[PDB]
């Protein structure tokens, strides 16, 4: 009879991650970790410390790769009418997805566990001012890390910067990238070949016939420095505009000045590049573009009738 099954998850120390798993492809058979303010050690099969190979996990649908050392739980040998304890240590490695949201001071794993540290914590040029909730000795950034795939057993030639964090339950590792050019608070949504811009009533109206949408903006431009983490907008807008101009308007039109930035009601950031023929805050965006479409529709019809009827008036007059 099972009288109790204590199942725990312990982190793998750095010196076992780098020296053993990443280098030799093996993992220690004993887990030595601090739990509940006490340094416990667990020996696999109640036996001596050993290096065990990491073999691929059984295939499951729509799941990332996994490796484990032991597949069978060890239970004590039978002794008549005696409570007997048996240990089983299984060293597990799982590639997972990790997700973060603004302000990117904490990120989540696909297992539903959290890691209370910014994904971009590091060692170079202010990469240590990012939020951390753990002690400084729980973090280790190995610079120039040679990842060795545990299936193909081939060492990657190009080194990468690898953050490692030893949480009380597990140990995460991920490639390090700078925060500023990786995240953004704005996403490129649409590319408009012909965005006609008009000025009227101290406002700019940008009308796109391709998608049937009219935005309204204040006369002034939008200070791009005001956008938090706004390093992606410039690059994306420039690349898109260059591609699109090369695709269509190279032979007939020319660019006029640097791309301008305007803010449109509902929270839409329009980068506009004018053409001539050869002759710190976070912006909240509405979830329904429909109003703008309506505007364009109401504009279009109106304009036409306000033309046609007007001609009739003159035609009547004469």
């Amino acid at each position, epitope marked *: 009879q099972f009288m109790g099954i204590f199942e725990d998850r312990a982190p793998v120390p750095f010196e076992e991650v780098i020296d053993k798993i990443n280098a030799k492809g093996v993992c220690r058979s004993t887990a030595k970790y601090v739990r509940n303010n006490m340094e416990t050690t667990a020996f696999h099969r109640d036996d001596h410390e050993t290096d065990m190979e990491l073999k691929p996990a059984k295939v499951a649908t729509r799941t990332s790769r996994g490796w484990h050392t032991t597949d069978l739980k060890y239970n004590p040998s039978r002794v008549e009418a005696f409570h007997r304890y048996g240990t089983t240590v299984n060293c597990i490695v799982e590639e997972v997805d990790a997700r973060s949201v603004y302000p990117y001071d904490e990120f989540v794993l696909a297992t539903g566990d959290f890691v209370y540290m910014s994904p971009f914590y590091g*060692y*170079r*040029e*202010g990469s*240590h*001012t990012e939020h951390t909730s753990y002690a*400084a*000795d729980r*973090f*280790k*950034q*190995v*610079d*120039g890390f040679y990842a060795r795939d545990l299936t193909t057993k081939a060492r990657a*030639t*190009s*080194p*990468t*910067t690898r953050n490692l964090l030893t949480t009380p339950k597990f140990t995460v590792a991920w*490639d*390090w*990238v*700078p925060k500023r050019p990786a995240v953004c608070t704005m996403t490129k949504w649409q590319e408009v070949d012909e965005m006609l811009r008009a000025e009227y009533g101290g406002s700019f109206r940008f009308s796109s016939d391709a998608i049937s949408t009219t935005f309204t903006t204040n006369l002034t431009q939008y200070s791009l420095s005001r956008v938090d983490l706004g390093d992606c907008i410039g690059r994306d807008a420039r690349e898109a505009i260059d591609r699109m101009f090369a695709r269509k308007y190279n032979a007939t039109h020319i660019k006029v000045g640097q791309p301008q930035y305007y803010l449109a009601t509902g929270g839409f950031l329009i980068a506009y590049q004018p053409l001539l023929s050869n002759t710190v805050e976070r912006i909240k965006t509405t979830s329904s573009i429909e109003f703008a479409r309506l505007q364009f529709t109401y504009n279009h019809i109106q304009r036409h009738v306000n033309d046609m009827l007007g001609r009739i008036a003159v035609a009547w007059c004469e």
Partner: antibody
Amino acid sequence: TLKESGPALVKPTQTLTLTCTFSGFSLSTSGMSVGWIRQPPGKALEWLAHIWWNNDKYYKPALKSRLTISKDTSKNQVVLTMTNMDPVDTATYYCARIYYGYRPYAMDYWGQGTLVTVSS
Amino acid sequence: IVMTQTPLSLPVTPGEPASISCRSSQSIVHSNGNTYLEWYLQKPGQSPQLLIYKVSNRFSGVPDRFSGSGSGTDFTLKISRVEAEDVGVYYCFQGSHVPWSFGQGTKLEIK
């Protein structure tokens, strides 16, 4: 601002310890790192080790098995230990401070360095 | 990554430009997109001092004569007008990828 302290005469096959005293920075700020460097007389500079503010020590792989760098912020010092001394290691040792935490250039301020000779 | 500084000894008459080149076995490009290759100078009986960082940036307190360039695995220090005080040993050092290393260094000679 980085001092250099170490036995000038150490017999072969013995443990060696050094010390680097700081001034104007503490190895407890979020972006301080201190490195130990060696230069044999008349040969090129050789990087040996460096420690970050969070006890993240990195060694030279060739000398990994022997070097041991430790930090004590209470005294505001770094102790570099090199076991199994070898007369090939007679050289001048320098202590450097790194601003990779803040600037793209490392090893700005060096100590005067101390000459250590391995002989009986 | 191993740095190979060439030539080992560079005798140059004062006023004439001097060239030092070092090559690495592997790209010193970091995931930042920056190459942390820096040139240091050691004067006779003196602690070595940094001259150039990030290939093409001159450290504070360094005159315009020193100029770094290059990319990938090749890098070149150029002194447009060598002076009397330029005598010393020059090192190129890569910090992007642990383990770090210095080149063999080049000794300047004045003729």
